[PDB]
């Protein structure tokens, strides 16, 4: 593909 | 089935007075106060009739002292004794559930006198 998107906003775990 | 109809027709009483819904029907019902067997009275306005043959019943709505008292009565039950129509109401609807919200002047209906 031409555009590969930004991945899913992940789990916090901070 | 013929079995159910034969079991019901031997128990139904043959002296049921015919009355349309809306009639001012006075019903005298037996009651057992322990060692007493008293025939009490209940006079009101019929607002519903559910015909089911032996399982048939009819409502008698009564405005007693304070608030209204609604009480159904089975037609072919031995606990009731007499059904006497006092006035012949002239409503054109089978059920009269709209009379529940109406108290006082709006509760009364038309007389047939046909």
């Amino acid at each position: 593909p031409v555009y590969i998107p930004r991945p899913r906003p992940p789990h916090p775990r901070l | 089935s013929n079995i159910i109809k034969q079991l019901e027709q031997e128990q139904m009483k043959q002296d049921v007075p015919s009355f349309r819904p809306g009639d001012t029907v006075e019903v005298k019902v037996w009651v057992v106060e322990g060692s007493k067997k008293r025939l009490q009275a209940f006079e009101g306005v019929v607002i519903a009739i559910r015909n089911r043959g032996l399982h048939s019943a009819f409502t008698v709505r009564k405005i007693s002292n304070g608030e209204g008292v609604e009480r159904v009565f089975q037609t072919h039950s031995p606990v009731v004794d007499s059904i006497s129509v006092k006035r012949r109401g002239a409503v054109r609807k089978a059920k009269l559930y709209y009379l529940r919200e109406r108290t006082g002047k709006a509760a009364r209906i038309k007389e047939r006198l046909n």
């Binding site: - | 009651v31 002292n65 009480r71 606990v79």
Partner: protein, 122 residues
Amino acid sequence: MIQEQTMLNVADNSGARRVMCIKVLGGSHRRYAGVGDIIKITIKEAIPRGKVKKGDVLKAVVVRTKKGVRRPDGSVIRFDGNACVLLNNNSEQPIGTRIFGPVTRELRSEKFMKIISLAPEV
């Protein structure tokens, strides 16, 4: 059918007008009351000349239901409003001297004698 947070009218002239049923007394995890069961109420509205004040938490007995009570013949008795009679929390012995509205025959058992004695109908 009287359950928690149910507003009821007071049947006798003890003084309160609107009460709120807070718990159906008798048996744990019980949903709603019956014909003449004991409930616990609080007082939300009262008259100035009442024997009890607004905010008293006390026991009462249901006498009239909108759900209806069932006679064993197959009939039902439905009233146009919920109603209760107030009781004094260790011995029942109701406060009001006159009781308005009819009651049910199954209330007559050994402790509610004053209520059905003061009942004008049934």
